[PDB]
Amino acid sequence: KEIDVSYVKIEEVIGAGEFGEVCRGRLKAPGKKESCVAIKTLKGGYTERQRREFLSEASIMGQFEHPNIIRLEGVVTNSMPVMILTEFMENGALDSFLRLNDGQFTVIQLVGMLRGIASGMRYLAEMSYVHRDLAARNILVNSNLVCKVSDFGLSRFLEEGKIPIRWTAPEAIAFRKFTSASDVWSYGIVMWEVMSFGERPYWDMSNQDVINAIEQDYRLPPPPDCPTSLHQLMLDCWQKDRNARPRFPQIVSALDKMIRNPASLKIVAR
Ligand SMILES: Cc1nc(Nc2ncc(C(=O)Nc3c(C)cccc3Cl)s2)cc(N2CCN(CCO)CC2)n1
DSSP states (O other), X not given: OBOOGGGEEEEEEEEEOSSSEEEEEEEOOTTSOOEEEEEEXXXXXXXXXXXXXXXXXXXXXXXXXXXXXXXXXXXEOSSXXXXXXXXXXXXXXXXXXXXXXXXXXXXXXXXXXXXHHHHHHHHHHHTTOOOSOOOGGGEEEOTTOOEEEOOOOOOOOTTOOOOOGGGSOHHHHHHOOOOHHHHHHHHHHHHHHHHTTSOXXXXXXXXXXHHHHHHTTOOOXXXXXXXXXXXXXXHHHTOSSGGGSOOHHHHHHHHHHHHHXXXXXXXXXX
């Protein structure tokens, strides 16, 4: 959906992306009220291949419509600079948002965030889309604490960017078989990131140390104050046999049960 350049106002540069700046702005189109948008720009000095990779994210995002998936507003391609516009997520990336707010949200709030992420993933799996880079740094958060999946692209990993080892299921590392079940492994890592308020998975371990540890049956321990039932769900996501892991509909169901029976979240390890 091509957007007339005159409908777009850039207000402030708010971050740095893979291909250039990330901005906050306003979109005002005839017959519609003004709305806030995030804007990524691609400025001159790039290869034609880079332009396609940049715009591919908009093509893929535009295939989806779900409250926990970032919404595309449109693109600017018949003019320079090239732009992609989405809904504006006032709290930015989830991992840094939680680090800024360490210990300041309740267990029930954290579970609600995890439920939104799992609902977005349930939708992607139903659409036969495998994310491959599910991580808290790729979840965006709005003013109401709603969490939405971002970072869309179908390009192969370098070995087939590099494979994100700490988030990746062991069969995907070893054999490059990426499936919704490998995204479930990654989702378990995201759960650990959320319940630890943005700690780095596996701390200072090297990538090869992580690979070897997982093969030797190590799994991340419960974060401080984490309900045991949430850590058990993490362990279920981290089963070595991909066919034994829960599927995303089952994950959403488990989180919904916790929200409805919050007394079950009181048990914590000693
Ligand atoms: C970098 C950043 N993004 C924010 N919100 C975003 N919403 C949507 C974004 C976005 O990337 N969409 C998008 C995607 C996903 C793909 C292609 C194209 C596009 Cl356009 S980025 C907020 C933010 N903050 C800075 C720090 N704090 C403020 C100061 O205290 C909190 C807020 N920082």
